[PDB]
Scaffold this active site. Structure first.
Site, short mmCIF file in Angstrom:
data_model
loop_
_atom_site.label_atom_id
_atom_site.label_comp_id
_atom_site.label_asym_id
_atom_site.label_seq_id
_atom_site.Cartn_x
_atom_site.Cartn_y
_atom_site.Cartn_z
N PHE A 1 -4.95 7.05 2.50
CA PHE A 1 -5.83 5.99 2.01
C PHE A 1 -7.23 7.06 2.19
O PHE A 1 -7.62 7.00 0.39
CB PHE A 1 -5.77 4.57 2.89
CG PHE A 1 -6.29 4.77 3.64
CD1 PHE A 1 -7.88 4.64 3.98
CD2 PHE A 1 -5.25 4.66 4.84
CE1 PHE A 1 -8.93 4.81 4.88
CE2 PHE A 1 -5.92 4.60 6.31
CZ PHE A 1 -8.05 4.38 6.34
N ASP B 1 2.02 -5.60 5.73
CA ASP B 1 2.19 -4.48 7.05
C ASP B 1 1.68 -5.43 7.80
O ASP B 1 0.25 -5.29 8.46
CB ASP B 1 1.07 -3.33 6.15
CG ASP B 1 0.84 -2.37 7.67
OD1 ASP B 1 1.99 -2.57 8.20
OD2 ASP B 1 0.44 -1.33 7.16
#
Ligand SMILES: CC[C@@]1(c2ccccc2)C2=C(CC(C)(C)CC2=O)Nc2n[nH]cc21
Length: 335
Positions: A33, A144
């Site tokens: 990310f 997640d």
């Protein structure tokens, strides 16, 4: 110290940026990310997380689009977001900071070869399902769920779901990727490669979290994407051809024999209604919120070990009740 000053759109509501200043920027965490920082707002002293992501000027950012829609006591607030800068552009998400997580607190007890008491299990699990009810009501899967992504203030006992980096709005039409969730908490349909999975994957992962809070370690620790499946069979038994169709040889080791001897039956029941192979036969977050297990939190004489009152567990919105508002009678008792 070094005092950085930016013009940050607030996360909530009307799209009108204001000047914002912060100073004690230390790096924490890494990933595909970008980077996450910690920092201190000047306006108040309050600590903030700043996730810094590379942003293609043309394409919209999924996390931001999801985060901006959310306002719920059990989910991180996106306080602000702001852009910054080769000819390269970065999105910076300014998120609410909580110093502990469920993983960390659970890890305390585990290292003392010691139990997290059932009350904290109830409290934490309840608030989790509660945040899932809410995000599922917008068709958003988190994808997640795991203890490392459950912020926790252990004094208040307030749990707040966080990291919407894998989150996505699921749509009857579209395929979605099957290698998601962190390996121990991955739903079995995803190990079998399914690309039509629903929000019921989060529920499996919530189930894997409970299991773990009751055991002191993860319930299905697998070596690879693939061994994960064998570690599930070890407990659930082999799935039937019928089950396998619904997702798209060994005998089932009974749940009660899975946990420590003194474990609540109500908890073990709930675990078996979460860790079902057939994703439609898993409870919904709100059905689980209402599960008998959580009855101690609806007693009006429920108190936290440290003396204090429980956090607010019944300020349910319309939106959170969206999926089955009959349940309001069970979830919201007298007071
Ligand atoms: C600064 C980022 C952080 C985080 C981000 C993603 C998952 C968990 C926590 C961070 C903490 C405390 C921590 C768990 C010790 C380490 C950590 O990564 N708390 C947070 N609150 N908001 C964002 C955070």
């Amino acid at each position: 110290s070094k005092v950085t000053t930016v013009v940050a759109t607030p996360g909530q509501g009307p799209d009108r940026p204001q000047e914002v200043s912060y100073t004690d920027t230390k790096v924490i965490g890494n990933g595909s990310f970008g980077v996450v920082y910690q920092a201190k707002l000047c306006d108040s002293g309050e600590l903030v997380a700043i996730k810094k992501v590379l942003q293609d000027k043309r394409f919209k950012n999924r996390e931001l689009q999801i985060m901006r829609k959310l306002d719920h006591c059990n989910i991180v607030r996106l306080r602000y977001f702001f852009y910054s800068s080769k000819d390269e552009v970065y999105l910076n998400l300014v998120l609410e900071y909580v110093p502990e997580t469920v993983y960390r607190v659970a890890r305390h007890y585990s290292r003392a070869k010691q139990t997290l008491p059932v009350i904290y299990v109830k409290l934490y699990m309840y608030q989790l399902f509660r945040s899932l009810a809410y995000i599922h009501s917008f068709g958003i899967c988190h994808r997640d769920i795991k203890p490392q992504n459950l912020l926790l203030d252990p004094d208040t006992a307030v749990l707040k779901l966080c990291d919407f980096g894998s989150a996505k709005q699921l749509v009857r039409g579209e395929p979605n990727v099957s290698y998601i969730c962190s390996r121990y908490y991955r739903a079995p349909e995803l190990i079998f490669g399914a690309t039509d999975y629903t929000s019921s994957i989060d529920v499996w992962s919530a189930g894997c979290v409970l299991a773990e809070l009751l055991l002191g370690q993860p319930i299905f620790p697998g070596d690879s994407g693939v061994d994960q499946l064998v570690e599930i069979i070890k407990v659930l038994g082999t799935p039937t051809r019928e089950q396998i169709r619904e997702m798209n040889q060994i005998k089932a080791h009974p749940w009660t024999k899975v946990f420590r001897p003194r474990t609540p039956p109500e908890a073990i029941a709930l675990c078996s209604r979460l860790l079902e192979y057939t994703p439609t036969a898993r409870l919904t977050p709100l059905e689980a919120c209402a599960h008998s297990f959580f009855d101690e939190l609806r007693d009006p004489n429920v108190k936290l070990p440290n003396g204090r009152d429980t956090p607010a567990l019944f300020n349910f919105t319309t939106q959170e009740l969206s999926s089955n508002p009959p349940l309001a009678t069970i979830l919201i008792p007298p007071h």
